[PDB]
Subunit: 333 residues, 4 copies
């Protein structure tokens, strides 16, 4: 049996995570669910957005599915954001963001790519200083983190049909940091004979994602860069509302939708569980259940295409009805 940690988090995490739990159970796989809490609502109760227990429960399971974390408007004494934290604490060094065409209004066809972003360093070391009216931030690239992220993106590419990786970078303007990242990935790519490795300057890569996204298979890049390119690519195929995500290290992983807590629509029973369900499909895949992953994805596609749709997506099916449809389509495969 697999042990899955479920963390609902904030707002509509309380609706999409139960949705995904149901779909997961409909796979027929041996699944044991543990619950834990994190995020703003948690913070408002216990002065921390990731209690120690939640770390312990995470580490006790094969994988974790997380719902939503509320973006703080004001800055709040003591309130570190939860995903940012778990990334560091659990060393989830690889951020995996697929962008795939879905049968939905205004989403380009012919897109099927995976953006693998370094999750640990670059501008995200968060080592800023302000002296008089000048502020400075470290942007840090190491050979170690670059190998780690290189090998991850390479493992992902090699299990995909087109066997292709683009290293997106800015080595021309930043040859010491960004060049180190470019070169290390190229170096590490040598134990992956089956993969075609190109490199592309990040600004041009963004342009190419808009004009010719069908050109890409897997893209590897650094922290801020990948942040932008993922979110770029999601606009191509539905926006954040349908964007799944993995956060993967060597011992455990956390999967989450990218949409926030959606504070308005929360509690209203109309949130679309797609992002959460697809994240759960990513999770099944990471666990080694490739068939179920593909079955879960196929189910979601069918309901997105023909079955009842949620108000973000045209229709006025509830989360319940949408989830019901997905469960049905899944059981029939």
């Amino acid at each position: 049996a697999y042990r899955i940690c479920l963390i609902e988090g904030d707002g509509i995490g309380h609706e999409v995570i139960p949705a995904a739990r149901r779909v997961l159970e409909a796979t027929g796989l041996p699944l044991e669910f543990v619950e834990a809490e994190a995020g703003w609502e948690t913070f408002e109760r216990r002065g921390t957005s990731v209690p120690e227990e939640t770390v312990e429960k995470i580490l006790s399971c094969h994988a974790t599915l997380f719902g939503a974390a509320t973006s703080p408007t004001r800055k709040v004494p003591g309130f570190f954001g939860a995903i940012r934290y778990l990334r560091r604490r659990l060393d989830l060094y690889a951020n995996v963001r697929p962008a795939k065409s879905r049968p939905v209004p205004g989403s380009r066809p012919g897109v099927d790519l995976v953006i693998v972003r370094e999750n640990t360093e670059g501008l995200y070391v968060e080592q800023e200083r302000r002296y008089l009216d000048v502020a400075i931030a470290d942007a840090v690239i190491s050979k170690k983190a670059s190998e780690r992220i290189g090998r991850a993106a390479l493992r992902i590419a090699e299990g995909r049909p087109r066997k292709t990786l683009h290293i997106a970078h800015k080595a021309n303007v930043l040859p010491l940091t960004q060049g180190l990242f470019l070169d290390t990935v190229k170096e590490v790519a040598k134990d992956f004979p089956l993969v075609n490795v190109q490199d592309i300057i990040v600004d041009n890569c963004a342009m190419q994602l808009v004009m010719r996204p069908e050109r890409f298979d897997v893209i590897v890049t650094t922290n801020l860069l990948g942040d932008i390119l993922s979110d770029l690519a999601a606009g191509l195929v539905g926006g954040l509302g349908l964007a799944p995500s993995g956060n993967i290290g060597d011992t455990t992983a956390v999967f989450e939708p990218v949409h926030g807590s959606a504070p308005d629509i929360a509690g209203k029973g109309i949130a679309n569980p797609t992002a959460a369900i697809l994240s759960a499909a990513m999770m099944l895949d990471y666990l080694g259940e490739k068939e179920a992953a593909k079955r879960v994805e196929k189910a979601v596609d069918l309901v997105l295409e023909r079955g009842p749709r949620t108000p973000d997506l045209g229709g006025d099916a509830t989360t319940e009805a949408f989830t019901e449809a997905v469960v049905e389509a899944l059981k029939s495969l």
Copy 2:
């Protein structure tokens, strides 16, 4: 009279700059032209991409139109990029990049926005270090540069119909640097009572540029961020082949197409001079010939929709035939 400096630079700059000059003359404004050199082809004949005398000439003119610079593959000792240099030397702190729909294959309709990128600091401060297997770059944000770029963008936004400015930033993960930028632009916006100032996280903005680009008017952001956003935006309206730009400081400004030298077509008389002509339009606008600028742009759109098309647009018109068509179109408005 206005004195314009023409710098052809490398490759197709030798074709598109003379094309722009012809159009500039067909406006019947009082124009006097001087010529300078910059770039790789110069570097090869002089040990410098920007001769000190090119700098003299630029400063003796009202404005500069620059063709294209080649970048070689692995850097040559002594060779710095001509544009990068002129930006520092001449303190052209505002990089201005329109993305406007055109009647051309592969351009969305309904787009009309301007990205204003800080052109001086951020990651382009070029301050890297490498200690053992760890590399570190400075990312620098100062009040003063942020003030300068803020007002540049607020000036641009309020000469435009919708009078709207979005500040694109990453102040949430980077509150000292990116937060200084946000607060400074917000601060100086107070002298611009006609402009509706919004802000947006840079990843969100990337996504929104892809999904709803018609919601944006002007966007202000920092150096690397802007480099990425501008090229994304260019993908929405034809790519780099048609993208005009200006580098503007307090005393001079240098305008240039973004397409590059294009060595594989250089010399064949089939380069599209559109990006240069629109750069010359931007320049006329900078000089205060607002109405001539609008005329030049209209001339170009007329021809794009209904005149000779160059091969990159699916046609077989020479640079010559296209330029004549613009000249004629222009002389009828």
Copy 3:
């Protein structure tokens, strides 16, 4: 009356401040003493080494006399050293450290100099980072801080008979930081034309302090440099038991002996109060009571020459017998 804040701190702080207080009362000046609390012991009782009410009492006084603070080697969470906090909280940018020949065994004669050390920046910004096996610390020189310290030291030079200021620096290996410090002091020196200003490289300076200290009147230098040069200087004239100090800014000042809490000896009834009494004399001077200050100095010399010596000076006298001797001598001046 003059309002003096008294902070004992830790260990011998408890023995030498009461001694300093008695000597201050013995001048017959009008003095109100306000007692406050700071340091290690205070942290153990209160969860902060500088209670907010302490900061208040200080700002409510004309000047503060501080005893001694332990900084345990152990690395404890929540505990920041008291003096470093107050330096930054109260903007006490000038560290003033006289070294004067005195009649004790091991005092070189002919020594009479003041080291003025920049107290807010340099290595002391405490902005360090560790990435894998590489640690980086910021060392910051600002123009603003350099003029403030240069101006402070020129003024102290000005009110001294020799009118000689040495700027000690390392601008040779550090042209940008140390060069800025050096040049800025030279720029401000222009408002003090009667002061003879020299520049000496810090290491040569260290050497000259050992060989020929009579060469120096006033020395100005940066944070870590002044730290080291002060302690070298104190060594020539009897060491830490005798060394006084002021941390002075624009609105208040805290005077403090250089020695620490001295756990090995605290409670033993035998610490040398000279350093605390001389720091009190510096405080009187700062308060404008220059005759009284010299008088307190004279009483101390008289007793150092002839009177009961404490164990650190080869005698068998207690802190109390030393104090009453100084008081007695003072009463007779």
Copy 4:
């Protein structure tokens, strides 16, 4: 034979280096001298201060004896300090700086210590940046370089009667940088269990070197710290004119006097060649000629005690006459 590369450099380098050669010859050792040039005079007639030809000569030799460098009072385009370059280029990571009592006026009795300073990093990485009116320099400490210098110091301690090492640090204000260094030198000490390892804060060390230098045998410290400490120490025992040094790596070593090129004195044939001779002695020791090196040391001491004294030591002897006396003293041992 032993191949010794001789570099006179600038000013009195031209006088003392031949004095040193003569004294080396008189030892009777099999020696080959290979003449090379470096320094300011070398830059003025050749455009670089270390020709590539010099570097070759050095690396073709077992050891190098260098005289002195003028470091001029400006930013001469192209001119870098010769020794500063050689330390980087040859990886001469250990700066060995002995301070021993000698029979001369000014010299304090009972001093016999060695300062071993880290020679590649800390503040000497020379990564300075100036942004507006704020300047920042990296101070870098790596575990790797600290292993290398700790080990070098421990061997030196191990090879000495008293078998004592003090690690001089500022880990209290700088726990990430100076802490790393302290800790690393302590882990490496585990391999030298017969060496007694103390730690002392750097400023407290400076004080202690003035009051009780007897307590030191070997001191290890980081770059800037050792710079100041060594020059402090030289002050105890006669100053620069008598102060030798080594710059030692894993493959080669350059030895050289601490004093400058002495332009006021150059050409007058009255410079004191002690410092160059004692550096020649250090070199002998580095080459395994440990008895020879002592003989040379002892020959110098006899001449310091009895024989003709140069003007800097209150005699009227020529550089020539001092040298001849040293040679004769040597030959009779």
